[PDB]
Each structure stands twice: as structure tokens, then as C-alpha cells.
Nucleic acid binder design. Sequence first.
DNA 1: TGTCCCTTTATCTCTCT
DNA 2: AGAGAGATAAAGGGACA
Length: 491
Amino acid sequence: QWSGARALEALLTVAGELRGPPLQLDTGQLLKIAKRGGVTAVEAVHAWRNALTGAPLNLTPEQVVAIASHDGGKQALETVQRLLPVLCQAHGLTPQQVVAIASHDGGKQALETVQRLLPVLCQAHGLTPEQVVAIASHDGGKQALETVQALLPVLCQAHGLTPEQVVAIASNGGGKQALETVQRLLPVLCQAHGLTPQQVVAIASNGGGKQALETVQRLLPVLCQAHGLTPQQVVAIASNGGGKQALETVQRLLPVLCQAHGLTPQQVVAIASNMGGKQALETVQRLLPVLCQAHGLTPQQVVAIASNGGGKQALETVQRLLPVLCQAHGLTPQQVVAIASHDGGKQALETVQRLLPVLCQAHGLTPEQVVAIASNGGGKQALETVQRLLPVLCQAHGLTPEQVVAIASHDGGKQALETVQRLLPVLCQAHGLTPQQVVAIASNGGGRPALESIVAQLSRPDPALAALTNDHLVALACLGGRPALDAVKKL
DNA sequence: TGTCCCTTTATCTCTCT
DNA sequence: AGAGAGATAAAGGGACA
């Protein structure tokens, strides 16, 4: 017999029960826990289903799933029910922060280390609990936390970094490795290659930060005379997420892409300067001619699609969908390029294909409006949120579809929409803002925290803002959102 | 195998002017 | 408004007990 048969039946038996009270988990939630936390995590969730759901902890189903769905998920579940009350009552963390720390591989370790080191990091090293939480909230959080305790002094004193920079480097998966590498390579990269400490911190502050720094050290000379790449270009490739893989792939593919396709080094660097830049470049090499053939898309448009995180996904999705979206849905190919040219272009493209008919027929939007909503980062999220909230926003709150479309049509559109839905009543009824004013605040990137800052100032007034009328606060919030409001308090 | 840690890739949100 | 940046998540490998 296949040995895993017994364990699979075990998994499936306990699985079916969890669909019952008090968690009621779907198949996706169940598969998720099984694939990352394994059967032990599934058995643990069931075993501790009642201890977590309500009294005392009051963890949602979602939160239980978030904790359970990682390597050692069973350990994190045991640790949370034990340490959540300690970290909340004795260190003043919110349950949300405890759950965030918990929801990574080795969550147990992170939680116990936060419990152990938060006092010394805050008192003796001058960090805030929020900074400690951020450091802890990644795989290997325990290692990062111990490494920050160990290295914060030498990094600030011997190497001139600020505590904020140290915290930023630590606040990535593998943070311990990046910190140790920065300690070693900061003088080398700064003195031999003329990089600013800020540039070094930028390269280091990514997952795989150790690899990106070591690859910059190794490849900077070669890249900056053989290829006539500037240091600024190499730093950009190394600091934007693509890191080590992106840098090595730029070395390989720059001449190929320029010579075979007529791209500039700037176009190649742009493609490279994203998460998964390696994947994007290789896909461009493959797919550009296929996309530009038969007088199809231009190289320029192919570059734009490629030049975002998930570029590879965007490119292949366009390849699969350009025909059906243009022909069956009636989009210009220029409209398809527009939707594709953002982080998560693939998600947005697939969501437009799925939801354009529904948004048009059931909600009365134009395809232009669907395209506009789709054409931002997280376009998929904004499109699904418009589908869900258009009727309550229009019918119960009185907004026009035009206003809903405007709110949705920025990065974070989903967040802006949910926050208007949530806060419009108290803003208008309780505080005398007009709906137009609420829509105006919400119709920018950062619409949600801009709205929340306004509500905070109207419900728990900070005297530092008291000289501003509601109208002036509205103008400020529209101009620069939460940050402008915060900046104004500081003076 | 279960748990911990690290790296890559992809997606989403907000800030900075 | 479009670059820059942080946050978050999925998924695979190394390491070890």
C-alpha cells in the first residue's frame, strides 16, 4: 500500500468534522491548513476548536486558520492560547498583533521570543512595541529578534545606521541573515563602491537581503563597465525585490534583449526592478516577438506589462486573454495593456474577463468604468468590492455609481470602498460632512486611512488640529491624506 | 515527519510629492 | 499620478531531531 493512505484518511476524517461548529471551514480553508500546517495542524485545530473560538480568546475562524496554516501550526496554536493573554495584558499588545506574530512558520518561537525580549528591546534598546511586533512578524522572527538585540549597538555606533534602519532590515524573512550581512558588507559597499548607507539599507531590506547584498558586491564592478549600467541602476535592481536573481538575470539578458529586440538598458532595468524581475525578463525574451507579431502589441506595451511585480504572470495572461477580451468583450488591445500594467496584472485581467459582463449588465457600468477600476494595483480586489458594495453604497448611502467608481479607481480601492461604507454615516450624520466631501477624501490612494484620520479627529479631537474647521480638515485630507493630517499635528 | 529558518515570486496597500 | 516602499501570502529547499 501507499504509506500515506492512512494519514490521508486521518486528514479527511478530522477534516469533515471541522465543517461543523464552531468553526465551519470550507474546502479551501481546509486544504490550506493541510498543505502548510499538515495533518497535525488540522488535528490540532479540531482538538482546540472550543478553547479558541470564544471565551476567553474570542478568535475568529479566519484567525484560527491564519495561525494553523504554517509549518509548526500545531505549536503556534498551543502557544497563542497560552501567550495571547500574557502579551496583551502584560506587554499591551492587541490580539491582532499577537495573531500576526503567530501566523508564520515557527510562530511558537516568535511568540516566546517576543515574550522574552520585548522588555529589553523596548527599555534598553529604545524600540517601540510596534517595531518589536514588526520584527517578529516574519518566518524566523525569533532569529531576527535575537539578532537585533545582539547587533543594534554595533550597527548604529560602528556603522552609523539609525535604529529605524536596523528595524527595517530586520523586518523581512531571513532578517537575521540580512543584518549579519549588512554588518560585514556596509564598509565594503560604501567605501569601495561609493554606495550611501541608505542605498545599502534599501538593498538589505527585502526577503533574501543577504543574497542581494552579496550579489551587488560581486556583480557591481562587472555590471558598471561591461554593460555601462550606473550604480544607481544596479542599486535599483537589487533593492526592488528581484534582488540576487534579478541582478544575475540582468547580466545574462541585457545584451540579448537590447540586441535582439531593441530595448534600452533603461527598459531592461525597469523590467528587472520588481519582485520576480528574473521571471519577468526571461518571459519578455520568450514572449515579446509572439506578442508583437501580426502587427500586434508594440514592444513598448510589452515592456510596460513586464515592468511590474508579477510581470511574467501579466505577460502570459495577456497572451491567453488578449484575443478573447478584445473579440468577445469588446476591449481595445490598448485597454488590455492598461489593465495588465500594474502589480497583479494577471489577477485584474482574469477578474475583468469574469466580471465585465456582470458589472455591465447587473450594475449598469460601462466597460470603460470596469477598465478604470481594474487599472490599478489590486485591481481584482477593487472590482470584486464594487460588485459587492455598489448596491448598498448606492441604495442605502445615496452615492451615485459614478461616485462609487471614482472611489474604487485607485490603489487600495477595496479598502476605500469598505471604509466609506463603514464610516459615511457617522461622518455625515454625526459630524456634518457632505457625502461629496466623504467621496472626495476617499477618492485618492490611501483613502481608507485618510477617512480614519478624519473620523479620529472628529470623535477624539486632538487640540493640535482644533484650529482647523471640518472644511479645512477635508481639504487637508484630500491633499495628503493621513500623512498631511499627522504632519500638521507635528506643527 | 514535524518544525524552524531562509529565499523566491506574486499580490495588495499606502506614501511621497 | 506614477515611483518607492512596506506588508502579506504561497510555496519550495536546507537543516535537524
